[PDB]
Design a protein around this ligand. Sequence first.
Ligand code: BG6
Ligand code: GLC
Length: 441
Amino acid sequence: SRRLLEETLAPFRLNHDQLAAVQAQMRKAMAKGLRGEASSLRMLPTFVRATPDGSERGDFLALDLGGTNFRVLLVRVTTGVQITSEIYSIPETVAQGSGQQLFDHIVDCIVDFQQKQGLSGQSLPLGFTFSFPCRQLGLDQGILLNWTKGFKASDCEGQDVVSLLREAITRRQAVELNVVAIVNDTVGTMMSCGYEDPRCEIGLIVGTGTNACYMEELRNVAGVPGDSGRMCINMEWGAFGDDGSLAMLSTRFDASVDQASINPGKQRFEKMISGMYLGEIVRHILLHLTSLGVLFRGQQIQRLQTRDIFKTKFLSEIESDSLALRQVRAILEDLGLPLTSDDALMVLEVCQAVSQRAAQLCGAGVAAVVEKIRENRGLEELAVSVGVDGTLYKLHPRFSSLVAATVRELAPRCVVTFLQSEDGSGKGAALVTAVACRLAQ
Ligand SMILES: O=P(O)(O)OC[C@H]1O[C@@H](O)[C@H](O)[C@@H](O)[C@@H]1O
Ligand SMILES: OC[C@H]1O[C@H](O)[C@H](O)[C@@H](O)[C@@H]1O
């Protein structure tokens, strides 16, 4: 009875050696990607060559697309930083619709925002936080390689997103685009937390999707020219193991989720960690358990067939230690999954199991990065801060802690501090754009 439950959850409980191997293999994927060999990490240059270098003034507009929230932002950088913002809705219809409609909508929001802020005629430098993989050969350009997460907008892949915006601006007849800067949310976060922490050289995202960036030494980035200095690299680690190198880890439940997704075979490592997917990993487990007769006494809970019932907000609430079992059951009776205690206990165990692996994997990841940076600089010890954002990370009872613990376990010679971004990527984006303006003048 409970024997089957543990047998089933066994693969989600990774021992030290297993986790070390994950770190080992990411470390290898990083090496290869940078030398231009075949890696599942794209290791994309971002052309951000320094964390916030002292004073960098300017008033910037800022887009933030690809997260749970799409937001337009005004960012005023002087002695201090002042941000105004407004969220707008992007339904799956628009997100997976036509590129034309997508950016038409984006522009409409900018006009709306601008009109509400009195910006109006003034065409400001835009800091575009665009949380997807781009091939950049400069701050002011970024060719979308692939959509990820919940996006599938047509006629966009292979397009420079700065162009995609121009074409929309001209169509919606908005104010002419000025200096635009493309930044990944990881890079945006890193730079935001970097504003008031010089040792911040890594951006980590664990929300809808997961990814990381970090300051690599320029000599090691074979794709780009130059030797002196360093440059931030967007690892795009969500797609880690897309080459099938993480077959060792994939459970049957991971498989079921992947095949059932918009992008089968893609972003495999992400599908074992981030908020968009964890809830589903659980659901399949529960389905398997019910069919084994363990859960629900075999009885068919059709509601369990419904996709995306276990959301981050829920996964974070279910595991709160301040909940009594009656309250856990209440929550599930409130999602249309009434449970008996025993069932409720197994469900809660399943969540812990999944979210644990999620935190641990991410930990092994951060471990590889911090080690890479340390070894890159020939150091025996490293003090480094990680600018981190994401609702899962930010809300989940144990995730952040379990990561920090894993980073100690696996990268002891490094002293890693985690900074939670209080102001989002818009702040960092603006700082990057400041350089992009200097780079034009
Ligand atoms: O998908 P989530 O939970 O909103 O987390 C990721 C996002 O978190 C936001 O706070 C950042 O400003 C975005 O740049 C980022 O993409
Ligand atoms: O938003 C978090 C992450 O989502 C996906 O992994 C994207 O590929 C990546 O660009 C982004 O950083």
